[PDB]
Structure formats: C-alpha cells, structure tokens
Amino acid sequence: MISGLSHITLIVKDLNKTTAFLQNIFNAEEIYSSGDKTFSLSKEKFFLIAGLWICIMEGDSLQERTYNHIAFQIQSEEVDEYTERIKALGVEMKPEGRSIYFYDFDNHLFELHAGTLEERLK
Amino acid sequence: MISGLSHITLIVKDLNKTTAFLQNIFNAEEIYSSGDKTFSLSKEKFFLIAGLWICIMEGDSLQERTYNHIAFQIQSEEVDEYTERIKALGVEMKPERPRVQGEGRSIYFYDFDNHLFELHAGTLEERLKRY
Ligand SMILES: [Mn+2]
Ligand SMILES: [Mn+2]
C-alpha cells in the first residue's frame, strides 16, 4: 500500500526568486541545495513546509494557467492576514470555508484554505 | 503559519475514467461525489489517497506535459508489483531516470490528462545523509 506522500516537485524559471516567495509566504525552510550550471547540472532545492518535502527545480514555467492546484491549510482567523501578505508580493491573486487563490512566478496555482476535510463534508 | 497540506485538485476531461485509474492504482477511497446531491456547480469527486485529500474536477484544461509532479511513498520491495499493476492497466511509464547515490527506486507514469505521478521508494533522510 501507499504509505503516504513522499514529496512534490515544481519546475520554475528562477530558483532564487521562487525561494524568497516560498520563504516569505509559506515560511518554507530550505534543507538542501544542489546544481551547477558550469557542470551542466540543473539547480534545485528541497524545502520543508508544514512537514511536507517540497522540491524546486529550475526549468521552464508552465506555458498556461489551469485550475489544477495545491492547497495548504491555514486557520480561518488568518485569512485577512495571509491575504495581505500575498498582496504584498505583487503576485496575481484570483479574487463553509474561505480560500485564497494565487499564482507563483511560473503559473502554479496555489491556494490557502481555511477549513478542513471533516468540516467540508459534515 | 501553514498547518499542513489541505488538498490537491486536478483537472481532467473524463471524471469516470480518471476515477477508475485512481481506484485501481492508488486504491483511492471515494468520499465525495457532486452526484451525491442536486445542483452542483461542476462535476467533481473527492478521494482519500494515503491520507491525502485528492479532488478531481471534470474540465477542458489540458496543460502540457512537464516534470512538475506529485510523488507518493512506497517500499522498494513493492516496486515490481506496482510496475506490474501499472503495466496491466496499459498506462504509460517513463524509463528509469539517472540517479545519484541515495535517491532510491522510482516509477514515473501519467494519468489520462498529462498529470505526471511518481511512486518513490526512497527517503529524504538518505538523500541528506551525504555531504
Ligand atoms: Mn481547492
Ligand atoms: Mn520526484
């Protein structure tokens, strides 16, 4: 059986920029970094966000924006908080349980969700 | 701060066909179907795949293929069995990728909507154990 989630890898054009993004918004915690353009090895980093192993690799950004997305959990008391924090990165946002939708610099639609599965159904 | 992962939402052209895919390969547990009620903004179903809340919505968006992927954990003793289960379903599988020491065995395959999936038999701990 599938023990659970291993990790999630995203491709981005600028690793440095995306990193600040993950650090400013998700408080991502870089734990690994590799790569060497002069040795023809793509650069990539591993971050930890709320216990999840997130890998970022440098490459081409999604050529288009779709509604496929990854959503992280936040308390409903912090919606306004995270909404303003995101509005501050210049990134474009797409204006029960309240949710915040926004893209990174590579067309990856992310969401900050207030509310859980249990609530969702019940 | 972020409490954790809420869910992952994928967009597919054929919900019923994608559902079979998930239930067969990932033993996905369906816990919700917009069909369960009357009047639903869209055709969608929610599944539980190894703790994760996976949501599927029927749509037309068919993003290009990229190395953006989601990887689930498995044991290395199960790599053959999963390769067999995937082969049996006729789903496309990528060749083995080049790896550094401490990466672990992996299986890469797509669904029917350009969603690259991975079954990983390694651990982050073995990948950080080196300089
Ligand atoms: Mn969502
Ligand atoms: Mn991977």
Which of B27, B49, B68, B108 has the highest number of chain A CBs within 10 A, making it the mutation to test binding with A? B68
B-chain residues near A113 (CB < 8 A): 6-7
Contacts of B42 (CB under 8 A, 6+ apart): B34, B57, B58, B59
User: In this structure, how many other beta carbons lie within 10 angstroms of the beta carbon of residue A30?
Assistant: 14
By C-alpha distance, the chain A residue nearest B47 is: A117
Q: How far is the CA of A113 from the centre of ligand 2 (A)?
A: 25
Q: List the structure tokens of A59.
A: 């490459």
Main-chain dihedrals φ then ψ at residue B16, nearest 5 degrees = -60, -45
For B120-130, b where at least 16 C-beta lie within 10 A, e where not — what string?
Answer: bbbebeebeee
- State this model's resolution in angstroms: 2.2
Contact at CB, A73 and B115, closer than 8 angstroms: no
* Catalytic site residue from B29, B44, B78, B81: B44
Strand, helix or coil at B100? coil
A69 lies within 8 A of chain B by CB: yes
Q: Count CB atoms within 10 A of the CB of residue A122.
A: 6
Task: Give the DSSP H/E element, type plus range, for residue A17.
Answer: helix A15-26
3-class DSSP assignment, residue A22:
helix
Question: What is the rounded CA–CA span in Å between residue B14 and residue B50?
Answer: 23
Instruction: Give the helix, strand, coil percentages of chain A, each rounded to 5.
Output: 25, 40, 30
Ligand with minimal distance to A5 CA: 2
A21 φ, ψ (degrees, to nearest 5): -60, -55
Expressed in angstroms and rounded, the spacing between residue A112 Cα and the centre of ligand 2 is 23
Method: X-ray
The residues after which chain B has a C–N gap greater than 2.5 Å are none
Report the candidate in A22, A1, A20 with the shortest Cα–Cα distance to residue A108.
A22
Q: Which residues pair with A70 in a beta bridge?
A: A110, B8
Q: What amino acid is encoded at A109 in this protein?
A: L
Q: Return the closest-CA partner of residue B121 out of B63, B80, B65, B90.
A: B80
Contacts of B116 (CB under 8 A, 6+ apart): B65, B66, B67, B68, B69, B70, B108, B109, B110
8 Å CB contact between A13 and A105: yes
Residue A33 vs residues A55, A56, B100: alpha-carbon distances, Å: 10, 9, 14
Rounded Cα distance between A112 and A106, Å, is: 18
Give me the residues near ligand 1 (ion), CB cutoff below 5 Å.
Answer: A 71, 111; B 9
Report d(CA A115, CA A75) in Å as an integer.
7
User: How many CA atoms does the CB half-sphere of B94 hold within 13 Å?
Assistant: 20
A residues 8-47 lying closer than 8 A (beta carbon) to B: 8-11, 26-27, 31-32, 46
CA distances from A2 to A86, B51, B56 (A): 34, 9, 19
Which ligand gives the minimal distance to the CA of B73? 2
* Domains of chain A, start order: 1-122 (3.10.180.10)
